[PDB]
Symmetry: C3
Subunit: 313 residues, 3 copies
Amino acid sequence: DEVRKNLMDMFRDRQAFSEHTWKMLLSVCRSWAAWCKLNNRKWFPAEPEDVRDYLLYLQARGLAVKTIQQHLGQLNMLHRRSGLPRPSDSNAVSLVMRRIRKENVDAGERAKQALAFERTDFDQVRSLMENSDRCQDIRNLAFLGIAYNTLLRIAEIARIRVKDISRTDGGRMLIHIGVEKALSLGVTKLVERWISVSGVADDPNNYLFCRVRKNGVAAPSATSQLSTRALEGIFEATHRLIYGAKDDSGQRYLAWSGHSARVGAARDMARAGVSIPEIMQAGGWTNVNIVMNFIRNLDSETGAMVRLLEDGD
Amino acid sequence: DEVRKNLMDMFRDRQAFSEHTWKMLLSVCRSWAAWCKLNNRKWFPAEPEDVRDYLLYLQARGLAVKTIQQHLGQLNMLHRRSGLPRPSDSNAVSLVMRRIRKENVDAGERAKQALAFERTDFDQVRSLMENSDRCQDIRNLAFLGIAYNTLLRIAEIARIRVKDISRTDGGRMLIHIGVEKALSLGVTKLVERWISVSGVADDPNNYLFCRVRKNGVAAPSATSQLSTRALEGIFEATHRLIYGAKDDSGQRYLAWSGHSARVGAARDMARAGVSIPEIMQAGGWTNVNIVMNFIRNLDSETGAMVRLLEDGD
Amino acid sequence: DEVRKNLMDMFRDRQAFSEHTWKMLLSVCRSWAAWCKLNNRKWFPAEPEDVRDYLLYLQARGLAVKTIQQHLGQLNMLHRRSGLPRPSDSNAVSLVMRRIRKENVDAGERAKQALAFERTDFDQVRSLMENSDRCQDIRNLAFLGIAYNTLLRIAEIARIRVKDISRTDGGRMLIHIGVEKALSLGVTKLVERWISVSGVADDPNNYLFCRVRKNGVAAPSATSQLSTRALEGIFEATHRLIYGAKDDSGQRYLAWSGHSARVGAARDMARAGVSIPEIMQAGGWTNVNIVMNFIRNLDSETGAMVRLLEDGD
DNA sequence: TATAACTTCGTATAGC
DNA sequence: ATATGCTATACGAAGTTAT
DNA sequence: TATAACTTCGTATAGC
DNA sequence: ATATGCTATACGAAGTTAT
DNA sequence: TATAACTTCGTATAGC
DNA sequence: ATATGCTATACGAAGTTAT
């Protein structure tokens, strides 16, 4: 680690890449480094046949193609940055990444996706929570409403500041995102409750969402945001609420997570006949391929042909 | 052939590729081989300037760019498989495939597409056949209904087994495909007739469609399916029924073929304002590019701007 | 120039490329040539490190990535044509084009787009012009109608010949384009006025639009078309009409231009829930990516989620 | 004449 | 999220008629 | 104290 | 049908307050 | 027998 | 606007039953 760490420390501007990206670079580098160590190989610069065997090593441990792509990519970076040929540009490496994929496009392994939080889900949760006078519930129900209505990422929701909210037609809220997002009358109402009870509106620089301790005492803040982990947890808790704990099969997506609402909303708009430009606008997509992929798991069956044949649309 | 044949025979696992693919590999190889023979050239490994002249040869005979791409691709495979450089990776080859295309993107030659079997077509055929008490007609009308309603390929339709059928809302049938496909009330009814008269439901392992000999006697079966050729022929016959024989201009798509219903349905859904996700779901597409291309010949003119301007939508 | 010019003069068939393309080739070549001159460098064949410094030179002067891509592309052509390696295929060149882009995808510089002429705009213009008895106004209002209704490019509109017009359902006009474009009842009416007053229908080979001099006297013609510059000017004038002159900030798109109607119409159809195939048909697009990009600036906010949640669609 | 109302051009840049 | 190729518009300015 | 209700982390992997 | 790059979430677990 | 109504095939080419 | 890979249909013709 230290070695991995201190060696790096350079790339002049940390700011050259994202903190999220520097994080992954380190993990990979640490990973690659331990391996090279154990197997007595040269860490940097990296030899292709070694990179190739390192990926195979990842594959042989059960890692996704996407995870392997990651380790490869960060490795490619180091080299590229430090002005050296890219492991990727190595017949050996090219070849493995190809062998590894086929192996699974064949194998039937495909990228997963968060368990959808759809309208039926939202409705049910409201049936259970709308009446609650518990701060936590008032907060979380508003959070889910926004998540579902706006399709924003948890990192976007967490950074909403009270000053980002305005009103539009019919008094619905308007949330400005670095883009503007409109809430329905009902979601606006839930958010207004969270707002009146919480106190966040006391300082417009206050983040719309904040902690609520066991006291049930809220703690508005313009400097600290609820972690994305916390937001994930609201999803999970809510899941638990209606379905009880999860089995220990150890696999992802057994409960709702941070993308559940973005996934579900997308599916809801698609199943409802909504057009691609509108869908794109609802979630802020700019690529048709990216959005169509994101909705790769439409879960209802729309019977466009039945409708057409029955002339009943 | 034999030489072409027996030399191949290897690729350890036939199963490595599809039977349809091994078929094309052989044809090409036979083609390439005869040419090399006649022109005294080395068949394997293949020399680029020779591959290049072999493609030009295909072009100079009237073959489509897609057919040339095929011969090239199989040739590329052999080499790749047998661990050798890909003719494709040869300046000479790269260059021709480029020259050859331009030559036609210019030339105005474009990929064809099956003659569409659309709702108007389906309706007309029903006007003619619905009343028939002829087994053949009861069968074929049900086949066309499924083909149009579901947009399934002929190879998918041919492998439907009676046990793949269930019911849904309003008693409409549900056909499970390795995905589920819902039929409208009317198509379900046509299929039910075919089912009651044919006897296929006697053994649930029975393929939904089967032969009907000159006797008019059906022959249900769980081991043998109607060939895709036969299904193509139903399309053709039906075409002939309403338009009489085809001219001997010798060109493809003069009558309906196996894709006519998939093509037509797609066009019908597109002309009707149906959204891309729904269209995608109706035909089981996952790529937006692939579906938009497939509907490259929308044949009605939708006047979205006229509708918008006339505020009459 | 002369040197640039006369050296070129070859490419056997001028017809090998478009006149618009030969125009750009010359400009670039003239540009590149002057630079090479000033900086004492070899014009042809071109050395990569020189090409690289020439692009940097363009960047260092404020030119768009698209403009740089152009100079690069024409340069690549010359070489390619004259059977030489492509500057593009040069580590140095590859690298700059990459550095230059990042520099702006980062920089926030993005391709611009013409100021939209949308339905609200069309309506307003009609409020102002419909009553006019001025030839110029009768002409221009019809031109804008066609531009908006059909989404055709100015070079397509300019080449419409009176003989390209037919009628359809309800007596709406049908304009055949090398494709057929239908006008609404109202736009057809505006065009009919322009037609009756102008005299163009006297010779069916007459271009639908023609000059109208200060006399107010039209000059129908089957040999000369209104320049695309003129059409651009109608857009500008009309803009000026409702907003007065433009500031001298010197930037593009301060007033309506030739693409304003194609842009606006597209946005209008998108905001209205119209499907992608229909949108594609309205503007004659065949690529989903190309159309989605073209509508990268949807300007209204459709609230598909609000509609869905309010069950009010 | 003077001028509108164009056309022609050349560099810059969007869109298929 | 993405590069590279050909063809189109953007627009100020200079040249052209028929007034 | 114990604890809820967080935050911080690190490996794994989805999505723009 | 498709590769490769950067940035985001997924989630168990270990650390942190204010009860 | 003759024949319909298939199946099998092989080259050509569309579609995922 | 775009190349390249694998798998499917297109269709005339020759072979196969059960009439």
